Paper text:
The integrated stress response (ISR) is a conserved eukaryotic stress response that senses and integrates diverse stressors and responds by reprogramming translation. Loading is catalyzed by the guanine nucleotide exchange factor (GEF) eIF2B, a large decameric and twofold symmetric enzyme that is composed of two copies each of five different subunits, eIF2Bα, β, δ, γ, and ε. The eIF2B decamer is built from two eIF2Bβδγε tetramers and one eIF2Bα2 homodimer. Upon ISR activation in response to a variety of stress conditions, eIF2 becomes phosphorylated, converting it from eIF2B’s substrate into an eIF2B inhibitor.
ISRIB’s mechanistic target is eIF2B to which it binds in a binding groove that centrally bridges the symmetry interface between eIF2Bβδγε tetramers. As such, it acts as a ‘molecular staple’, promoting assembly of two eIF2Bβδγε tetramers into an enzymatically active eIF2B(βδγε)2 octamer. (A) The distal portion of the original model eIF2Bα from the ISRIB-bound eIF2B decamer placed within EMDB:7443 after lowpass filtering to 3.0 Å resolution. There is a helix (amino acids 44–56) out of place. The average CC value for the chains belonging to eIF2Bα from this model is ~0.74. (B) After manual adjustments in Coot and re-refinement in phenix.real_space_refine, this short helix is placed inside the cryo-electron microscopy (EM) density with an average CC value for the chains belonging to eIF2Bα of ~0.77. Closer inspection revealed that ISRIB slightly draws the decamer's two halves together by comparison with the apostate but does not induce marked changes in eIF2B’s overall conformation. In the apo versus the ISRIB-bound state, eIF2Bδ L179 shifts slightly into the pocket, occupying a position where it would clash with ISRIB binding, and eIF2Bβ H188 (a key ISRIB interactor) adopts a different rotamer. Overall, however, we conclude that ISRIB binding to the eIF2B decamer correlates with slight rearrangements that are primarily confined to the ISRIB binding pocket. The A-State also contains a properly sized ISRIB binding pocket, thus rendering eIF2 and ISRIB binding synergistic.
Numbering used by the authors:
A (entry chain J): 1 to 12, 21 to 134, 155 to 236, 239 to 243, 296 to 306
B (entry chain B): 41 to 279, 285 to 466
C (entry chain F): 166 to 522
D (entry chain G): 4 to 79, 86 to 252, 270 to 305
E (entry chain C): 8 to 98, 125 to 351
Write the structure that this text describes.
């Protein structure tokens, strides 16, 4: 099995993504259908429990061949989710999560992850300053502005390596990442970092117990 | 409308120590040809009809040299206006003098007098005019850059620049120099100023061929503190806007320091600045015509190559030169009327006019200016300079960084002989 | 089942029997993401091949052997079956997927043939795990010797041929030729190398960068100007992609042209190759068997006017960039292999000796 | 020393004897006399003999012999040398029958009524012509005078005793007489891998003219002359063998066939023999 | 007066800096018009002084750009015309000038007919279902081929010229007329040569030896044609004929900025590597099968007689 897909169901102003709002099919039904459409006979889903166990009971009613819905603690997040499900995964991870209403032919992002043997591949569509190279495939710089106490950070070394960087501001991530096994090794070995979405930025693609394996390249796909 | 230009013939930033003290920087022969001659050739080739040569320091010498040049002949299609003043000491002063006297009228080429380039800016000029016509003449300047690599020698760390531009309108949003900086910052509201894609560029070599509207001069007189071009750009981008044109297939660079001088000389000898090549004799001279042989060996007339003397590659030999036998010249420019001894090894050494070298001399990556002299058994380490009729005695080996001249406060040597102090 | 790749563009009539593919339109967009029909490593390698990330012959063969190691390592014998036949039967779809992503090279063909021969030679009575890692160790030994020891031997044999102060002309990118020149410069030889390159791949920049990093004096020019520089050249060194039974050299498209012009200029032509790239196959032209790259690569970015932009919109316009060409054995002087120096006449003899005969 | 004078007197012993045969005889007696019973020390004395003998004589044939038969004996510890001397004796016997085999395979390739064209004096060419005339074959002969050492006159004198019309020609007149020669037979002094021959200075001219007129270019040589060299141009040949050079190289492109004791061979087959022998 | 001087200058600098006009037929027309205006707008009475000033200005022209030989050889044509007129009137001053002017006029009216002459001649050299190969771009050769295409069906293989891929626009122009055209890299010349019937190429200059100075890479194509014994045809008008010989001259190849061969963005290696970009190259006459001109086909072994017919032998040095 190349990929062991996982779908997180914990949110992370408008809409609790886990349970309530369903136009036509349950919120996780779209991720589950996207997964089952392209192989993925086995799926691991992480079930909320701060709802007082009101999520897993109703998500086994979608007529899917077989899925794994692991229970959670009284309250945890998404990096907590990955650390919780670490012992039961043994290969590369394809992390999605509940709020995913998308058209994506994920063959593209998975091919980006494969061809260049990336440490990580991501999916985005048009306050997070994201800078890519001329090809637009490899992730050079990425940083929110809530994080950014100082004005803006960019190293001279990365500009010497990659001269021109194309930047974007109005990019929103689909939370669709393809994680290596050793990145999950790093995550488990360092409980410091929570909120995976914020864990993408300490990529340290450039050379500084931190490299559990060489290069740790990262990549992006920008949708139509 | 016609096309004017401003040619600042005095690099006010005091750099060439003490080479500028003897003759102005713009008169330094790059490869037997002055830099101002290269700039005038570029200006008349790109289509400039009237230029304004502002000379401040050693103005008499510059005027005398230019008056005899081709560009001052009555048949020349490029008109020159040598302007004379000991008052202005900065580019901003030049531009405010321009707007005070009201010389330029429209889209004049601002350029210094020490630029080596062959860029045809008709495309950039029409782009600038289209931008100003469409957007209410709010674009005041178009900065012309060349696609480069951060590793290229012609991109010195002193003049290295990093910009943040708009990939759609190519307008310059942020601009700064990376001299001695391991950290670059780009303000936040750059993204607020242009909302359709910001791109940071570090591969851009600054050609210093900015083509500007008279509004640039109006602004330079509206802000007395504006002294040079970089300050003007910084002050305008923090507040009218500036635009850009990037060149891929044409050469351009200004000789700021000695490193840039060497790099641009090596590029010119190797025909990177075609058609501005030594063989072409772009200046209508008689002592500056050479025959381009294989491996870029511009063997001139009556050079008198010795028996077994070897010219490896990218070697220029001025006319009237005399080269001993069993010599080894490689990637070096030899000025006209130079005598070279026997078993002399020259490597990337720009021997100017009248240089006399005795037998056994080993000169590497040096610069012997006019009428320099070295005696028998003299070794020069890289980045060593001799200046204006200075003599180095026998059995001397100069260190790496060693400038020798007849000016005590401006050299490691003085009026005495170079043999010993 | 793996679908067939659509043949992009309009093929030249003489090459209608060969496939023409587009780099943009890949083959993995109709496959399951957790690939099951094709092993993950094999689809990975096919995608790497199609995009052109793996170019060199030695590089392609080594990547193939590593992917095959990853495959056999993860292979498990089904019940009531023997590994000998089952594994060689299961490897065929992977080879077909590869050849669909990009035609197999001679090194790849020879490696796959040797691997199948070894698999069929695995004992029926033997268990599974030690058979698997015996196959892994055999692949390790095979690649180790046939690549690195062959390279070292050929480097020594070529060093005892390069003299001091001689100009050597090289063409395109070749790991073997670059290693030979680097080792010759390190040993003490003082020479200069002229690098010849050709559109559209411009693979000569690779060996140019390698030589400049090694400190060897280098010069660069494209293949049309080769006639101008050969008077200075003292010797032509090339890297073969395949050596056929008749002694002909099947290598990059610009090799035979350079050999012809060098013969016209009295410049001896040397080709460096290993024994594992020898092939009992034979051809007399670049038409019977070749590879057609993406014709869209011919388009030149000459500033503002790309002339071949919409070449498909012109009915009578055909584009073609050949990846290989054959040099007749009489245009080549030396072939430097593990066995030493041989004439191209002696290639099939070496083939026989390497056939355990 | 001991080998120098014995080689000299072997040359004096048999003026009708080759130099490679004398070299193998001298090395055989050298190994049989000193009684070197050492696994690795024996090779030192061997290569000393070889270097001495090609220092006195600048022949590629002597060095090639040396190399091939030193490998042959080394390819054969007390019983090692005891069987090695056997194999050396049989090697000498085969090398003796070499020239007779060469004559009696190649004498049938001379169509009678033809015109042989030969370079400087060579024993193998003389033997094959003797075999041909013994088979009742009449033909005309042109011989190059071999200007450096007038061996063409010697060849003409030796062949006149065989009752055949011999016309020694000028060194530079082969280009004039090439149209009057039905074939060219030259005895190679050494055979390189690719099939070329490192023979006297004018042999390359012979071959080039042959290709200029499509005339068959035949070469006769013993297999102890097979040297493992690969010269690309004239200067690529070892300079020691050249000493105004004395011996130059001829590409296999210019040679039709080789007549060795191993049978008639295409210039392609000598490399096969050499790589089977493994130097 | 000064109009003539400034026009001569303008022309000199246009020839020196870049290529103007682009077509060398237009260059011949321009230089002939300028020579006419010179011979009209000077105070010359004896033919010797006129020839001397013409030689001086032609020396200046040749020094402007040596690789552009059309200007120089047409200056030599004008000198031969002056010599012929002087011999006619001496073997007479106003008649001399007007006769020289009408001679230049007939030269000019026959100048624009060379294109059409070669186009008409093209038909009897192309048969149905033939495979042509050509390299680079040549207006004469594309006119040749598109005139032969009106009555014949054939294939053209255009080898692009690196770095200046002028062959691409030639292939497009040929495809416009429905001439089945294959475009390839120059690296594939020998690989495809085995399937080519003829080679038709233009030229920049024909030397007295019969050799021709053509775009780089054409010498390799000629070597391939000789190897495969395919006829190599050169469709060159009679104003590209240069009386100079191959190695009695100077400045044969034209070297342009290496930026065309290796770009500036390669970085530090550009200080260690020597890049060379020769535009033209030398093709010996042994590799040419037939020359096609405005008068008709001729073997390379008759170009010397054409020289004797065009240029005075004392004017080969200008
Ligand atoms: O289709 C093409 C295109 O050729 C190329 C297109 C591109 C490239 Cl890369 C190379 C070649 N060429 C034709 C040219 C006629 C031929 N032969 C015939 O049609 C028949 O030939 C004969 C028939 C009878 C005689 Cl007597 C001689 C030849 C077939 C192929």
């Amino acid at each position: 099995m190349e990929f062991q897909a996982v779908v997180m169901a914990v949110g992370g102003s408008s809409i609790p993504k886990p349970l309530l709002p369903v136009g036509n099919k349950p919120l996780i039904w779209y991720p589950l259908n996207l997964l089952e459409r392209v192989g993925f006979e086995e799926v691991i889903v992480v079930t909320t429990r701060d709802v007082q166990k009101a999520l897993c009971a109703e998500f086994k009613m979608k007529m899917k061949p077989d899925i794994v819905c692991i229970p959670d603690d009284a309250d945890m997040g998404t990096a907590d989710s990955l650390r919780y499900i670490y012992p039961k995964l043994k290969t590369d991870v394809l992390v999605l999560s509940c709020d995913l209403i998308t058209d994506v032919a994920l063959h593209e992002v998975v091919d980006l992850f494969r061809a260049y043997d990336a440490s990580l591949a991501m999916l985005m569509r048009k306050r997070d300053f994201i800078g890519v190279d001329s090809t637009g495939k490899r992730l050079l710089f990425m940083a929110n502005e809530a994080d950014l106490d100082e004005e803006l950070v960019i190293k001279g070394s990365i500009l010497q390596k990659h001269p021109r960087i194309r930047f974007h501001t109005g990019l929103v991530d689909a939370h669709l990442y393809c994680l290596k096994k050793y990145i999950v090794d790093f995550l488990m070995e360092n409980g410091s970092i929570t909120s995976i979405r914020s864990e993408l930025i300490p990529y340290l693609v450039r050379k500084q117990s931190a490299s559990s394996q060489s290069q740790v390249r990262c990549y992006v796909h920008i949708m139509k | 409308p016609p096309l004017q230009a401003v040619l600042v013939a005095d690099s006010f930033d005091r750099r060439f120590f003490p080479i500028s003290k003897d003759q102005p920087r713009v008169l330094l022969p790059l490869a037997n040809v002055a830099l101002i001659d290269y700039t005038l050739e570029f200006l008349t080739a790109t289509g400039v009809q009237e230029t304004f040569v502002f000379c401040c320091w050693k103005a008499a010498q510059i005027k005398e040299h230019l008056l005899k040049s081709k560009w001052c002949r009555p048949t020349s299609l490029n008109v020159v206006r040598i302007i004379t003043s000991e008052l202005y000491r900065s580019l901003g002063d030049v531009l405010r003098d321009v707007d005070a006297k009201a010389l330029v009228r429209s889209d004049f080429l601002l350029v210094y007098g020490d630029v080596i380039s062959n860029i045809n800016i008709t495309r950039a000029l029409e782009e600038h005019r289209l931008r100003r016509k469409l957007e209410k003449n709010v674009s005041v300047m178009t900065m012309i850059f060349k696609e480069s690599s951060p590793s290229h020698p012609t991109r010195c760390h002193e003049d290295n620049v990093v910009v943040a531009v708009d990939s759609t309108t190519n307008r310059v949003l942020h601009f700064q120099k990376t001299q001695g900086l391991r950290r670059f910052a780009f303000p936040l509201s750059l993204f607020q100023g242009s909302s359709d894609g910001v791109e940071v560029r570090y591969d851009l070599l600054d050609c210093h061929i900015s083509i500007c509207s008279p509004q640039v001069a109006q602004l330079f007189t509206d802000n007395f503190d504006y002294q040079t071009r970089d300050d003007f750009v910084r002050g305008l981008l923090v507040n009218n806007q500036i635009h850009m044109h990037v060149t891929a297939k044409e050469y351009g660079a200004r000789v700021s320091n000695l490193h840039m001088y060497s790099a641009v000389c090596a590029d010119v000898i190797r025909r990177w600045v075609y058609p501005l090549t030594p063989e072409a004799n772009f200046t209508d001279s008689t002592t500056q015509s050479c025959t381009h042989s294989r491996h870029n060996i511009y063997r001139g007339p009556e050079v008198s190559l010795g028996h077994g003397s070897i010219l490896e590659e990218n070697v220029l030999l001025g006319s009237g030169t005399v080269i001993g036998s069993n010599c080894f010249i490689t990637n070096s420019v030899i000025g006209p009327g130079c005598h070279i001894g026997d078993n002399v090894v020259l490597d990337q050494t720009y021997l100017w006019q009248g240089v006399r070298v005795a037998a056994g001399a080993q000169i590497h990556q040096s610069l012997l200016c006019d009428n320099a002299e070295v005696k028998e058994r003299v070794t020069l380490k890289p980045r060593s300079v001799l200046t204006s009729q200075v003599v180095v005695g026998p059995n001397i080996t100069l260190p790496e960084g060693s400038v020798i001249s007849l000016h005590p406060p401006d050299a490691e040597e003085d009026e005495d002989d170079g043999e010993f102090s | 089942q793996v679908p067939t790749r659509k043949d992009y563009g309009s093929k030249v009539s003489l090459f209608s029997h060969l496939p023409q593919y587009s780099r943009q339109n890949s083959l993995t967009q109709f496959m399951s993401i957790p690939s099951s029909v094709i092993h993950p490593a094999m689809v990975r390698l096919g995608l790497q091949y199609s995009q052109g990330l793996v170019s060199g012959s030695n590089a392609r063969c080594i990547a193939l052997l590593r992917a095959l190691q990853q495959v056999i390592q993860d292979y498990t014998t089904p019940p009531n079956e023997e590994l000998s036949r089952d594994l060689v039967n299961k490897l065929k779809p992977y080879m077909s997927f590869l050849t669909q992503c990009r035609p197999l090279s001679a090194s790849m063909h020879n490696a796959i043939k040797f691997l199948n021969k070894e698999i069929t030679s695995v004992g029926s009575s033997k268990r599974e795990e030690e058979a698997k890692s015996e196959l892994r160790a055999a692949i390790d030994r095979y690649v180790q010797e046939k690549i690195v020891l062959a390279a070292q031997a050929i480097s020594r044999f070529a060093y005892q041929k390069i003299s001091n102060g001689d100009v050597i002309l090289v063409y395109g990118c070749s790991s073997l030729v670059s290693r030979i020149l680097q080792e010759a410069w390190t040993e003490g030889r003082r020479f200069r190398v002229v690098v010849v390159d050709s559109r559209p791949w411009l693979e000569g920049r690779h060996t140019l960068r390698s030589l400049v990093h090694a400190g060897v004096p280098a010069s660069y020019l494209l293949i049309p100007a080769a006639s101008y520089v050969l008077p200075e050249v003292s010797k032509v060194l090339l890297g073969a992609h395949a050596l056929l039974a008749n002694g002909s050299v099947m290598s990059r498209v610009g090799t035979a042209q350079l050999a012809l012009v060098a013969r016209a200029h009295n410049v001896p032509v040397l080709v460096c190759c290993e024994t594992y790239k020898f092939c009992e196959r034979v051809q007399t032209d670049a038409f019977v068997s070749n590879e057609l790259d993406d014709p869209d690569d011919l388009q030149c970015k000459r500033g503002e006017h790309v002339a071949l932009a919409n070449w498909q919109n012109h009915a009578s316009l055909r584009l073609l960039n050949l990846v290989y060409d054959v040099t007749p054995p009489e245009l080549v002087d030396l072939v430097i292999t593990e066995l030493g120096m041989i004439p191209c006449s002696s290639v099939p003899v070496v083939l026989r000796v390497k056939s355990s005969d | 020393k001991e080998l120098i004078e014995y080689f000299k007197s072997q040359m004096k012993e048999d003026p009708d004897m080759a130099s490679a045969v004398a070299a193998i005889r001298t090395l055989l007696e050298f190994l049989k006399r000193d009684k070197g019973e050492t696994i690795q020390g024996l090779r030192a004395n061997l290569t000393s003999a070889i270097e001495t003998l090609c220092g006195v004589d600048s022949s590629v044939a002597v060095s090639s012999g040396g190399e091939l038969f030193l490998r042959f004996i080394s390819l054969a510890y007390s019983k090692c040398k005891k069987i090695m001397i056997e194999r050396g004796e049989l090697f000498l016997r085969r090398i003796s029958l070499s020239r007779n085999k060469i004559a009696d395979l190649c004498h049938t390739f001379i169509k009678d009524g033809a015109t042989i064209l030969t370079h400087a004096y060579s024993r193998v060419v003389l033997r094959v012509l003797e075999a041909a005339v013994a088979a009742k074959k009449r033909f005309s002969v042109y011989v190059t005078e071999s200007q450096p050492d007038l061996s063409g006159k010697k060849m003409a004198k030796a062949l006149c005793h065989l009752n055949v019309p011999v016309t020694v020609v000028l060194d530079a007149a082969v280009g004039y007489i090439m149209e009057k020669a039905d074939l060219v037979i030259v005895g190679a002094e050494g055979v390189v891998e690719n099939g070329g021959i490192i023979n006297k200075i004018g042999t390359n001219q012979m071959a080039v003219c042959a290709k200029a007129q499509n005339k068959p270019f035949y070469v006769v040589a013993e297999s102890f002359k097979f040297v493992r060299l690969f010269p690309l141009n004239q200067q690529d040949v070892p300079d020691k063998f050249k000493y105004h050079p004395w011996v130059d190289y001829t590409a296999p492109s210019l040679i039709t066939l080789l007549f060795t004791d191993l049978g008639v061979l295409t210039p392609s087959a000598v490399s096969d023999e050499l790589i089977k022998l493994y130097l | 007066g000064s109009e003539l001087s400034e026009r001569i200058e303008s022309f000199v600098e246009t020839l020196k800096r870049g290529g103007g006009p682009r077509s060398s037929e237009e260059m011949a027309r321009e230089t002939l018009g300028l020579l006419r205006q010179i011979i009209t707008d000077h105070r010359w009475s004896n033919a010797g002084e006129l020839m001397e000033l013409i030689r001086r200005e032609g020396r200046r022209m040749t020094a402007a750009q040596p690789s552009e030989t059309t200007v120089g050889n047409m200056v030599r044509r004008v000198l031969k015309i002056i010599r012929e007129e002087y011999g006619r009137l001496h073997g007479h001053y106003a008649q001399l000038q007007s006769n020289i002017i009408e001679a230049i006029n007939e030269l000019l009216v026959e100048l624009e007919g060379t294109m059409e002459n070669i186009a008409a001649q093209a038909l009897e050299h192309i048969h149905s279902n033939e495979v042509i190969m050509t390299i680079g771009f040549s207006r004469t050769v594309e006119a040749f081929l598109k005139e032969a295409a009106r009555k014949r069906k054939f294939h053209v293989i255009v080898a692009e010229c690196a770095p200046f891929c002028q062959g691409h626009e030639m292939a497009v122009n040929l495809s416009k007329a429905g001439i089945e055209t294959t475009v390839m890299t120059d690296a594939a010349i020998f690989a495809v040569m085995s399937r080519v019937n003829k080679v038709i190429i233009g030229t920049k200059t024909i030397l007295a030896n019969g050799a021709l100075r053509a775009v780089t890479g054409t010498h390799t194509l000629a070597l391939a044609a000789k190897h495969h014994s395919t006829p190599l045809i050169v469709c060159a008008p009679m104003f590209k004929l240069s009386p100079q010989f191959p190695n009695e001259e100077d400045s044969f190849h034209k070297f342009v900025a290496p930026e065309e061969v290796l770009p500036f963005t390669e970085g530090d290696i550009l200080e260690k590597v020597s890049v060379h970009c020769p535009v033209f190259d030398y093709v010996p006459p042994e590799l040419i099968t037939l020359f096609i001109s405005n008068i008709g086909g001729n073997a390379p072994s008759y170009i010397y007689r054409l020289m004797s017919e065009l240029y005075h032998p004392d004017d080969h040095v200008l």
